[model samples]
Target: NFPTEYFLNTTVRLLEYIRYRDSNYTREERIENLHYAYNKAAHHFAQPRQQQLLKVDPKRLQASLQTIVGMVVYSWAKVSKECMADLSIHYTYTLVLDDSKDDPYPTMVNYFDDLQAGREQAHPWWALVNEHFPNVLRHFGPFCSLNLIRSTLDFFEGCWIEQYNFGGFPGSHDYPQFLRRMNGLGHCVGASLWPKEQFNERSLFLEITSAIAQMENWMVWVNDLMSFYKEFDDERDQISLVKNYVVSDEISLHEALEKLTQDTLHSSKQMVAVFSDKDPQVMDTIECFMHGYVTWHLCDRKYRLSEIYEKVKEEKTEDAQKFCKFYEQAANVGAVSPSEWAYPPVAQLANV
Candidate 1:
């Protein structure tokens, strides 16, 4: 019921104004790249998975595939054909694997047992991931394509730990570690845009420091605030920061939202203060990631909170008003859009 249209209109305009550094990456070419990857994924992955598991919801299959396609086209900044393909194929396979693990229709439980053990061949499309990724790490090639794989692995591990860390204090181990394992920030995207020195480190993991840990906390809050409704729905079976905080602290939902926002803001200013002494582009990467993420959630139904959003409004009580007020502020203030890393920066991309 909030200014959802206004939000989309304003952000989309901002996104369109972003200029891709490489002139060769025409709108049509990008369109075709995305179309090819999506079609490939649908044919080789989705269709096969669907046939094997009939009870699984059809929307889930299509939604998971389409969302990653949309992401590469919208949020990803890389211009490489291989990069886009890897993003699409890698995530699509993950969806397939996750769905299989759920075992809705008596599907295989030891699915990865073969895929990872070399007993079975992966879909031909996944070769780039299965071969190119770990192979590069084996040789210390520092090939950029592997970063996505590393990031994905890091994120999966982080997600596992997040279930245990809910309602936990902000004192995590290291900044870069928090950024990768906890914040769920696209640190890999930042690495994709990294200047030469750091990019060629032969190891995909970025350096972490104590100071950066506070910075990573901001994004965790951002995600928790933005995803609370879906998190609420999920808490029926999953662990969530919002739900845990409410349960463990004996606070109302309104207080939980406000406290999260406050904590996020304080962390933001702390990071901003720290970055004042660091590189300028650091802020740009953070901004680009947050803006792109926020824009995606605004439009994507995957995290739609209209049910929860509207219910609180219908409460007709002080608690409802407080919830609405904090939510509106979080939506606006947390919309920390950065310099458009949606595409490669001009210097890294070429062909004048």
Candidate 2:
């Protein structure tokens, strides 16, 4: 069994270390913006396609929608309303594919092939992404868009590798960090922050590089910290960073968790220190983003942080209720497909 006190202690310390309290965004603003993004992503997939996708399991679809709503309204909170809409659609599609059973190799290997041949992708997920991704790119400048595409492709490759890693193979000392970096999607989030209409990528090139570098560690480690409790009891997540440390270096689970907690605190401080002296626009944006990131984790039910928060010092917040309200509101929006109807034939060809 896990040390309940130790976990709760670290949770309190981490929140205090970052000085996180109320979100920079208000509850109502968050709910309004969440609906804006959720409605857009939902409407992008037409009614018939939404029904077909939801037919297998409406619960998963609802989860994906709520996840993106939580993300855009929080992590991407600094972005404009339209940018939030695009991000919501893109990530919602990404989650649907992540949940799908289709082999990733076809799209990962043949991405350029289908693009050059003008042939439709065999997988419905890629087809939807290809159709709408251009619009998402339109909001970013050259370098930002490049970083987005590269990091996303790396994410796909990471997922491919994860399939093999799940079988319990030995890995080198560096393998753990390497795998995390590829799969984390931190760089993508980093780049998405500086939209073309907002920040000039050409002038802010050096600052942007440093920002992405900082985000690559800060974003993923924070997630690892928040996710520790929920994932600890799940056998499928034994390949995690904390467990990786235990297996590779022969450390105790408690020690591994302690190391991660300390590392997360260091990164959180570094994020502020690095950006504090940069451009005010950059500083303001990152601060808002980081706080919102933590706020999302605290509020979102997926992490179950409310359970931990309740145990720490007998303190409580309405964060969980706020998220629940937004999720409930998100269900009211209608659905649309990003592309023409392709589910029935694509599911058939996926087997072909």
lDDT of 2 at 329: 30
Best by TM-score: 2
> Which segments of candidate 2 are over 4 A away from where they belong?
21-24, 47-56, 106-109, 165-171, 313-352
lDDT of 2 by residue, 1-352 (tens): 8576666556555555555544446555666777677666666654565445433355576676676667776777678888988887777766665555556666556767877999977656656666678988998999999988888778767777776654223445566677778788878889988998889999999989888999888888888988888898987676787777666656688887888888888988877767778899888778777767776676667777555544542334344333333323322221112222212322333233
RMSD in order of candidates: 10.9, 7.0
The pairs that clash in candidate 1 are 287-338
> What tens-digit string does per-residue lDDT give for candidate 1 at 1-352?
3433333332233233321112223445545665655655555443344344333455565667666665554444333454555556555544444443231222234436766687533332233335435422332234444554566566544544554444444332233234334335344443444333324443323432222344346545655655665665453434455454555566675665566656655655565565555544454544444444444454445677444446565555554554455445334432222221113221122211
User: What TM-score do all the candidates reach, one by one?
Assistant: 0.52, 0.82
> Per-residue error at 46 for model 1, in Å?
5.2
Q: Which pairs of residues collide in candidate 2?
A: 44-336, 44-337, 44-338, 45-336, 45-337, 46-336, 46-337
The window of 10 residues in a row where model 1 has the poorest summed lDDT is 338-347
Candidate 2 Cα deviation (angstroms), residue 126: 2.0
TM for candidate 2 is 0.82
Estimate every model's Cα lDDT from 0 to 1. 0.46, 0.69
